Amino acid sequence: PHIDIKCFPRELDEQQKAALAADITDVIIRHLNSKDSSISIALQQIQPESWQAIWDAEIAPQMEALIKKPGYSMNA
Amino acid sequence: PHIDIKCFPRELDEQQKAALAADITDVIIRHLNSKDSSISIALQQIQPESWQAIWDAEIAPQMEALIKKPGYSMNA
């Protein structure tokens, strides 16, 4: 599995990045029956003014297929 | 944060997809100082013969930045 995490900018040191990756890894192993070697994880920082593009391409068009829908909306 | 999970196909019912979403949500809240309302999660099942496109567009180019690198290589 390949997991992509997009979020607003924040400072994460190497220890933080590795711990987040480890917690994500174990969740994926549990739910998808995956092996550790099959998992890759990306963390991409997105500036606030570029979040609309993420909403438009990834969130809004897939809304009822999302496994977790956003509590916020960019189309109010 | 918006989380995208790509994996080879598997039989997952709605309760199973919600349980995966809940565990991912906890991890994101605790590591990114996030809130339930800010989190959206997509799950996309990709047939094995279409994984090369994922390697080429998402995994390989980001190798320098991934927070968890894959345990396999598929450069073609």
Swiss-Prot record, chains A, B:
Compartment annotation: Cytoplasm
Residues annotated as catalytic: P1 (proton acceptor)
InterPro entries cross-referenced by the UniProt entry: 4-OT-like_dom, Tautomerase/MIF_sf, Tautomerase_PptA
Main location: cytoplasm
Molecular function per GO: intramolecular oxidoreductase activity, interconverting keto- and enol-groups; protein homodimerization activity
Superkingdom of origin: Bacteria
Class in the EC hierarchy, top level: isomerase
Claim: Metal-binding is one of the keywords in the record: no
Keyword Disulfide bond attached: no
A Gene Ontology term for the protein's cellular component: cytoplasm
Keyword set, alphabetical order: Cytoplasm, Isomerase
EC number: 5.3.2.-
One Pfam family per UniProt: Tautomerase
NCBIfam families: PRK01271.1 (NF002324)
Recorded family membership: Belongs to the 4-oxalocrotonate tautomerase family. PptA subfamily.
Quaternary structure and interacting proteins, as annotated: Homodimer.
Known role: Can use enol isomers of phenylpyruvate, 2-hydroxy-2,4-pentadienoate and (p-hydroxyphenyl)pyruvate as substrates.
Entry protein name: Tautomerase PptA
Species for this entry: Escherichia coli (strain K12)
